[PDB]
Design a protein around this ligand. Structure first.
Ligand SMILES: CNc1ncc2cc(-c3ccc(-n4ccnc(C)c4=O)cc3Cl)c(=O)n(CCCN)c2n1
Length: 280
């Protein structure tokens, strides 16, 4: 009806000329340069995702291309980043603080371009971090994003992935763009330990634990620099006022030891090889 008609007007009807799959729905790679195209069988959430990315292009954000659809079902074409996801790196390799810092910088820069444009991601995690072969870092999957306004600057709906969700979100309190900061802090734990806290627990158990403990403890804090140790706490602070911002954290001392983005290309190569080991 109405909402489908609005989406119909955004979608192009030109000339449309394989990752495999597939969660909601399936994602492929094709030839019409190398691209990535998703298929969903058919809503305002789709419209919001397409609009936010179409109207907020950035080198630190995976680039939108075009939109098509047959009868129902829908096609979103976007660029392809060949280095894969950060999840493949954090789960198969060890990152030094220099490499961990470099990633956080690119992510904080991607969060500063968003927070200043009244946009909260709300689903920051390593799975939603994609890598270029040159070690470039880009944010993806904005299906959970929420645009804020001068009149309404906060929200109260429970959205995101449990293990990366800030306490104020799981306790159904009002929150802002600093939930992307907590999620960044959890993603830093990924780059240290391989997993977010409580990953062995089921998602509901994790939520309960996040409400209880608040700030999560690292398995081996003594293996970290006092400057990295400081960066984490500035991300994982309970008080929203005390917790750092994308702009504020971009000027942190931990990001000065950031290695060149080229230093992430051996991590990528390792991830690629380890992805081959798991199959054979
Ligand atoms: C591996 N390189 C790589 N590089 C780029 C991508 C891009 C996407 C990707 C990301 C977002 C969208 N998108 C955009 C706007 N509105 C909607 C409804 C939508 O689905 C489509 C794709 Cl195809 C995508 O889904 N993947 C798959 C893994 C991340 N989800 C990608 N993988």
């Amino acid at each position: 009806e109405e909402i489908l008609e609005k989406l119909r007007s955004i979608v192009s009807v030109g000339d449309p000329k394989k990752i495999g799959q597939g969660a909601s729905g399936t994602v492929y790679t094709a030839m019409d340069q190398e691209v990535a195209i998703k298929q969903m069988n058919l809503k305002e959430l789709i419209i919001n995702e397409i609009l936010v990315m179409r109207e907020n292009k950035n080198p630190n954000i995976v680039n939108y291309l075009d939109s098509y659809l047959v009868g129902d079902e829908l096609w979103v074409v976007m660029e392809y980043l060949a280095g894969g996801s950060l999840t493949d790196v954090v789960t198969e390799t060890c990152m030094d603080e220099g490499q961990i810092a470099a990633v956080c910088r690119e992510c904080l820069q991607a969060l500063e371009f968003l927070h200043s444009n009244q946009v909260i991601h709300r689903n920051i995690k390593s799975d939603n971090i994609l890598l270029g072969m040159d070690g470039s870092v880009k944010l993806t999957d904005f299906g959970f994003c929420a645009q804020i306004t001068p009149e309404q600057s906060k929200r109260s709906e429970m959205v995101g992935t449990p293990y990366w969700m800030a306490p104020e979100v799981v306790t159904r309190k009002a929150y802002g763009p600093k939930v992307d900061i907590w999620s960044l802090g959890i993603m830093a734990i990924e780059m240290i330990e391989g997993e977010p806290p409580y990953l062995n627990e089921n998602p509901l158990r994790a939520l309960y634990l996040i409400a209880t403990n608040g700030t999560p403890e690292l398995q081996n804090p003594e293996k970290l620099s006092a400057i990295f140790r400081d960066f984490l706490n500035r991300c994982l602070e309970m008080d929203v006022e005390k917790r750092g911002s994308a702009k504020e954290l971009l000027q942190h001392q931990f990001l000065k030891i950031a290695k060149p983005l080229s230093s992430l290309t051996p991590l990528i190569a390792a991830a690629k090889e380890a992805t081959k080991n798991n199959h054979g």
